[PDB]
Amino acid sequence: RLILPQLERERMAYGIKETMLAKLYIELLNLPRDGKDALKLLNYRTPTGTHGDAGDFAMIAYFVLKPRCL
DNA sequence: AAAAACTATGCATGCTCTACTGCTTCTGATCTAGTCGACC
């Protein structure tokens, strides 16, 4: 199921997507609301930040979380 | 006849209830914008 989440049927809809997941990450990590990391996570599509990948939300989240996790 | 002791009282303090009015803050209801899931 983890390898192919799209085929999951037993589990109900998560209800969280890129925007909601970014908001939850900002709230939990206690990052500043108007800080660079929060804007990058929320505006992951915008390439103005020129921080590695500009379209992949997962890559931006990994870059933001590299110094925050074990 | 003269001095001392007890009682009336009375005005002022601080406390207490009781209420009234104002400001600050918390809760709840409502409106509006954004988001997710399903399909096609």
Curated annotation (Swiss-Prot):
Lineage: Eukaryota, Metazoa, Chordata, Craniata, Vertebrata
Paired cysteines (S-S): none
Designated gene of the protein: LIG4
Cited function: DNA ligase involved in DNA non-homologous end joining (NHEJ); required for double-strand break (DSB) repair and V(D)J recombination. Catalyzes the NHEJ ligation step of the broken DNA during DSB repair by resealing the DNA breaks after the gap filling is completed. Joins single-strand breaks in a double-stranded polydeoxynucleotide in an ATP-dependent reaction. LIG4 is mechanistically flexible: it can ligate nicks as well as compatible DNA overhangs alone, while in the presence of XRCC4, it can ligate ends with 2-nucleotides (nt) microhomology and 1-nt gaps.
Similarity-based family: Belongs to the ATP-dependent DNA ligase family.
Domain of life according to the entry: Eukaryota
Oligomeric form and interacting partners: Interacts with XRCC4; the LIG4-XRCC4 subcomplex has a 1:2 stoichiometry and XRCC4 is required for LIG4 stability. Component of the core long-range non-homologous end joining (NHEJ) complex (also named DNA-PK complex) composed of PRKDC, LIG4, XRCC4, XRCC6/Ku70, XRCC5/Ku86 and NHEJ1/XLF. Additional component of the NHEJ complex includes PAXX. Following autophosphorylation, PRKDC dissociates from DNA, leading to formation of the short-range NHEJ complex, composed of LIG4, XRCC4, XRCC6/Ku70, XRCC5/Ku86 and NHEJ1/XLF. Interacts with DCLRE1C; the interaction is direct. Interacts with APLF.
Coiled coil: none
Protein name: DNA ligase 4
Connected disease: LIG4 syndrome: Characterized by immunodeficiency and developmental and growth delay. Patients display unusual facial features, microcephaly, growth and/or developmental delay, pancytopenia, and various skin abnormalities. Severe combined immunodeficiency autosomal recessive T-cell-negative/B-cell-negative/NK-cell-positive with sensitivity to ionizing radiation: A form of severe combined immunodeficiency, a genetically and clinically heterogeneous group of rare congenital disorders characterized by impairment of both humoral and cell-mediated immunity, leukopenia, and low or absent antibody levels. Patients present in infancy with recurrent, persistent infections by opportunistic organisms.
Parent-protein start and end of this portion: 69 to 138 of 911
Tissue: Testis, thymus, prostate and heart.
Subcellular location(s) of the protein: Nucleus
